[PDB]
Design a protein around this ligand. Structure first.
Ligand SMILES: Cc1ncc(COP(=O)(O)O)c(C=O)c1O
Ligand SMILES: Cc1ncc(COP(=O)(O)O)c(C=O)c1O
Ligand code: FES
Ligand code: FES
Lengths: 379, 138, 377, 138
């Protein structure tokens, strides 16, 4: 019972079958002017079109990166420095991934004014804030499609309406792609972050999608690959695998998602039968793969490791789990107190979960809670 | 983590309360918000019985379990030698960063002892063994 | 007859066998607090001790990156930006890869003073120049260990001595590892770039080695992996691949370097039997796998394409082969005329090269020179 | 490069020269150094003999091969209509950046028409064929 798909996924065998030839047989460099180079370019471009098509991205360009982290870095830093002349004011949602927040914080030292958009109790972004805080010098708004931590889906279309072409809209879609419909036209994205391993592709590759006419400066500098926006000999095999995964996701996703939504619901309706359990994130506007709960009187790392002795992988937002000893900023943003983020348990579902896994989670969990509770001074 | 940490956390020793408690020690970690209390019954200057109740991670449970296991049936003199580094060694070490969780258990055990002394007028003994500092801290 | 190893290399079958279980069975995230994370953790540190060992780096730390490009970007900018209070002066070699040069240029824009270190005819850096124009506000020197374009090995161990620790020494060793000895102790590296594909590891991953108690600021910001220096979930399969490759390079490099030089010379002493052929780069103090020759009256891309048609894959510094239509800067620094740079041919030999390949190379090339010359004014 | 560019690269049509003869145009490119020479002969105004000598990239060799073989059997009027874009479309397109390689095969066919004119004394045809710029260049 692996219930930790937010942090890492397996590569689909189909993706692995398309990758392998590029690793040993057709290993050429896309910039080489010979056959091996020409096969290399053609596969890279094929992939580029498959990632565009997944998101309906023909109105702009695909830039490959080492993952969602770098693409987020490039979209925030790269867009801001390049369009600084039209203003230095930025809005960034309070629940964004740290790969958007930290680039944001770097620009605050470089003379940009950043305001962080609060969320309500369900982790949903406050749209009236954006509307009021918007100025002649706002050049960029970054707001995720959905939260990987609490599963909340954000109001991007509205936001897009509000911004109504006064400022660039950057959308981190690492969480949403393959879960719910991701269409850059419908949602009015100017820049969109995509992640390969979130759609069962290989780790170590990603994409930023950039609408035509958006200009950026590059963050990784060298030989001018990706038209200058991202230097470095191309990781042809990962790109091809990214491409196979995109193809698979486009054809399979709606079925995959209805199956995860049912498993999720089945988990929620039974997990909330434990005394003192609460759901975090929105109950309805919620990714098909996301269950995030808390249990009073006990600590998160201890729930997660009890499950792991039974054979069940999960995740927590507890300060005790961090290493800097700080709870989740997503959880604090929603107005949870430090006390209550302690007992959080995050199950994220994915492609290889069975009804057997849920059975297992449902038979092991109540006893874990009861065991830990019997040892808690708090209970 | 380590093989003993995992054994203790999974099969923790001396879990519970004690109505009777000749001494009670409770501490909270300011940083992560862990809480712990140790119950002792003292008969002939020895921990006849000991229990703990702890709110914390896998380390805090393992450390609580070891500490109480190391204390059981010992004279008070002996039990006071159970520092955080003796709990950490007896478990196989801890990640630096889990180190405060052995602290938590060490303290809670020291406090239950000072508590036994303070409830029974043996206040000279608080002086004698240096724990004036720990006693002041309550 | 693939003679383009510096552009790309296959992954060794044995590296591949070691990566797969991490792609499909042990696919966890090292940050996770469970068995899948724990397994990913051991896999990553083994890999890390292994890359470290490979360059004698016990006295430092390995920081995993997405490739040699990114690693170079982190050593120039990460170091310059962190250590600015000490001075704003940097020397850079003029034959450095563009993943050093371009971050150096960026620094200039931000007000650092960068001077570029001239080389001689065969592309060897001018050491006296370093020595003279070394100031007291100098914080950083970047000099490659060897040059992928012309093979020339640089005098780093001496360069180290002329600095005496009045500046940090960055060395790009993309070309060098697996080819010639790379001990960071012998060369006095303070930072060393390493590339996984250049030693038959997988593409997509690379490393910076950093001497203990030199200090860098991160370029990729986020969730705080590699102790703050490089955020992003760790690409465990490719790291475990880089691990194996390092392991195999350490066993076999000396043997195969030998086979490679034997092949290089044979190509050299034959190819120059062609009317009007000049060797580029240093003839003796040279990388084992490297041949760079120019041909008068004809042009580079033309030569490479005629070879590819015979089933032979090679490279060129010709302006016509470039997307910016710029000739190789390495070759302009050497002082080759623009017209001279046209007819360069680059053969990069590697692990899968064999006698029969060379036989075939020597039997198809002469026809290409003569035939292309038949057309040229 | 298209399959047509390749065909004309491996098997270029009309490589060579015709000695001390009619039209011969030399042009080079300021940007990438390439050099080309075109050789022609005529009926009264209808090309019956043509060959080329070129220095440059695969694209460049392919433009002259296609430019030359496009101008075989055609009148002076017809092969003035062989432009940069015409050679390019015949070769089934080229990458931006290879386009100047067509200009070179166009202007070397331009200039060897500006020879069968400058060498035959016809200055009215040059100022009347809008081709005034090239006689005022060679
Ligand atoms: C929404 C979101 N954005 C970005 C990231 C960073 O992705 P990676 O660590 O693969 O670079 C994550 C992590 O999973 C994420 O959940
Ligand atoms: C000497 C040297 N350093 C660094 C690089 C950059 O390598 P990558 O393109 O794999 O980032 C190269 C080119 O491959 C190189 O030749
Ligand atoms: S109890 Fe908070 S870190 Fe161990
Ligand atoms: S001739 Fe130099 S680019 Fe075609």
């Amino acid at each position: 019972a692996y219930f930790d798909y937010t942090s890492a996924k397996p590569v689909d065998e189909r993706i692995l079958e398309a990758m392998l030839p590029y690793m040993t047989e057709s290993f050429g460099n896309p910039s080489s002017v010979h056959s091996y180079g020409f096969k290399a370019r053609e596969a890279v471009q094929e992939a580029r079109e498959k990632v565009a098509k997944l998101v309906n991205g023909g109105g702009g360009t695909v830039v490959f990166t080492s993952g969602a982290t770098e693409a987020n870095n490039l979209a925030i830093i790269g867009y801001a420095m390049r369009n600084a002349r039209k203003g230095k004011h930025i809005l960034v949602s309070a629940v964004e991934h740290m790969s958007v927040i930290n680039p944001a914080k770097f620009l605050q030292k470089q003379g940009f004014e950043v305001e962080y958009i609060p969320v309500g109790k369900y982790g949903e972004v406050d749209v009236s804030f954006i509307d009021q805080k918007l100025r002649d010098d706002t050049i960029l708004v970054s707001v995720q499609h959905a939260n990987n931590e609490i599963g909340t889906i954000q109001p991007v279309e509205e936001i897009s309406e509000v911004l109504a072409g006064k400022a660039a809209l950057h959308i981190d879609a690492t969480a949403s792609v393959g879960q719910i419909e991701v269409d850059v036209e419908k949602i009015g994205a100017d820049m969109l972050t995509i992640s390969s391993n979130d759609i069962y592709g290989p780790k170590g590759v990603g994409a930023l999608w950039i609408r035509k006419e958006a200009k950026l400066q590059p963050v990784i500098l060298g030989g001018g690959q990706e038209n200058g926006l991202r230097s470095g000999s191309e990781n042809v095999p990962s790109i091809v695998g990214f491409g196979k995964a995109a193809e698979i996701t486009a054809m399979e996703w709606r079925e995959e998602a209805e199956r995860l939504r049912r498993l999720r619901d089945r988990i929620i309706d039974n997990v909330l039968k434990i005394e003192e359990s609460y759901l975090n994130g929105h109950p309805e506007k919620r990714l098909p793969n996301n269950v995030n709960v808390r249990f009073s009187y006990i600590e998160g790392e201890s729930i997660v490791l009890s499950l792991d002795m039974a054979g069940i992988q999960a995740s927590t937002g507890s300060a005790c789990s961090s290493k800097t000893l700080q709870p989740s900023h997503v959880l604090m943003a929603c107005g949870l107190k430090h006390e209550e983020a302690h007992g959080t348990l995050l199950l994220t579902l994915g492609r290889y979960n069975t009804d057997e896994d849920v059975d297992r989670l449902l038979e092991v969990l109540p006893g874990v809670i009861e065991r830990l509770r019997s040892m808690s001074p708090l209970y | 983590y380590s093989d003993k940490v995992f054994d203790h956390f999974q099969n923790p020793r001396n879990v519970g309360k004690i109505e009777d408690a000749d001494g009670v020690g409770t501490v909270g970690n300011p940083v992560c918000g862990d809480l712990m209390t140790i119950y002792i019954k003292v008969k002939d200057n020895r921990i006849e019985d000991i229990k703990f109740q702890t709110f914390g991670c896998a380390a805090a449970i393992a450390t609580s379990s070891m500490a109480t296991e190391m204390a059981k049936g010992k004279t008070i003199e002996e039990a006071l030698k159970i520092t955080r580094d003796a709990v950490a060694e007896a478990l196989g070490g801890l990640p630096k960063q889990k180190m405060h969780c052995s602290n938590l258990a060490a303290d809670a055990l020291r406090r239950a002892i000072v508590d036994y002394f303070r409830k029974n007028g043996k206040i000279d003994k608080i002086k004698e063994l240096g724990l004036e500092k720990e006693l002041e801290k309550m």
